Design an enzyme around this catalytic site. Structure first.
Site, PDB file in Angstrom:
ATOM      1  CD  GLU A   1      14.910 -39.029  28.454  1.00 58.73           C
ATOM      2  OE1 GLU A   1      15.421 -40.049  28.965  1.00 58.73           O
ATOM      3  OE2 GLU A   1      14.848 -37.939  29.064  1.00 58.73           O
TER       4      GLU A   1
ATOM      5  CG  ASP B   1      14.023 -45.635  29.933  1.00 58.19           C
ATOM      6  OD1 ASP B   1      14.149 -46.860  30.128  1.00 58.19           O
ATOM      7  OD2 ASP B   1      13.789 -44.823  30.854  1.00 58.19           O
TER       8      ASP B   1
ATOM      9  CG  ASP C   1      17.915 -38.012  30.040  1.00 63.00           C
ATOM     10  OD1 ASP C   1      17.774 -39.206  30.367  1.00 63.00           O
ATOM     11  OD2 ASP C   1      17.374 -37.059  30.640  1.00 63.00           O
TER      12      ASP C   1
ATOM     13  CD  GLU D   1      17.891 -43.414  28.849  1.00 60.82           C
ATOM     14  OE1 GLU D   1      17.545 -42.253  29.160  1.00 60.82           O
ATOM     15  OE2 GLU D   1      17.611 -44.421  29.528  1.00 60.82           O
TER      16      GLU D   1
HETATM   17 MN   LIG Z   1      16.772 -41.227  30.957  1.00 59.56          MN
END
Ligand SMILES: [Mn+2]
Ligand SMILES: [Mn+2]
Lengths: 148, 149
Positions: free
Chosen positions: B41, B45, B108, B111
């Site tokens: 993650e 990102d 998340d 991601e």
């Molecule tokens: Mn995040």
């Protein structure tokens, strides 16, 4: 191209297909309100941030986010981008008018350059990233192990 | 009545070479302390940030930093990220313990999920980019013309 650009390109290690693409990334709005780096900077910001976290993830003998944020804050810091920029003497190619180049501006042209390389190469993120590592993977790596 | 563990690959249009890379992305600490999605993650990102921004830059009508930014914070928000994950039934695949999953774990995992693809792919940013776009290029453009935030 020109009596100048060719030299930034040999340091860059890349020759452009679209010369005006390169020029736009070095040109401050004070120089051309019509064709300046602001939009490329926007792109290159995300692009470069990606190149660097990748190296960060890939390397870095600690992998908890708690470790990764700090050096990251440094590695994207204007101070560090100026460091890599010096490897190309970018101050020398920036197009500006009534006023002087800054670290901040050098920092923003730097993001802009990489966004135009990305684009000029036909939005080739893998090549661009490697170009980037050829040039800077060495410093970034020395950085991570506490390089002042 | 089948394909519990996954189905997610056929949604993404991508089969992993290493399954535990996809496993890792959908795994939260509470289920596995050994390999949870934390590090992916982090990569993810930065990964998805660039996919979105690249789109934003070429498709938005206003190329000024002033106009781009407020749109950009929308397109990389948990809210919107969730709307992207709903198209993957991501919640379905998350290996999470207890009763509270939430909206933060999901975007998340969203991601960390495109970071696992990235990596599985041999770090093919381009392929991963297009794979991403095949699924959400649609909703991103849309959201640009309506302009939210
Ligand atoms: Mn995040
Ligand atoms: Mn900048």
């Amino acid at each position: 191209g020109m009596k100048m650009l060719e030299q930034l390109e040999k340091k860059l290690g890349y020759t452009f297909k679209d010369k005006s693409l390169l020029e736009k990334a070095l040109t401050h709005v004070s120089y051309s309100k019509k064709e300046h780096y602001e939009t490329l900077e926007f792109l290159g910001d995300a692009l470069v941030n990606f190149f660097i976290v990748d190296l960060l993830v890939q390397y870095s003998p600690n992998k908890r986010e708690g470790f990764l944020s700090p050096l990251k804050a440094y590695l994207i810091s204007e101070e560090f981008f100026n460091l890599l920029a010096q490897k190309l003497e970018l101050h020398k190619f920036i197009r500006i008018k009534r006023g002087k180049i800054n670290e901040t501006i050098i920092g923003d042209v730097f993001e802009a350059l990489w966004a135009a390389v990305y684009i000029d190469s036909g939005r080739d993120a893998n090549f661009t990233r490697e170009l980037f590592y050829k040039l800077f993977k060495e410093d970034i790596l020395s950085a991570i192990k506490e390089g002042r």
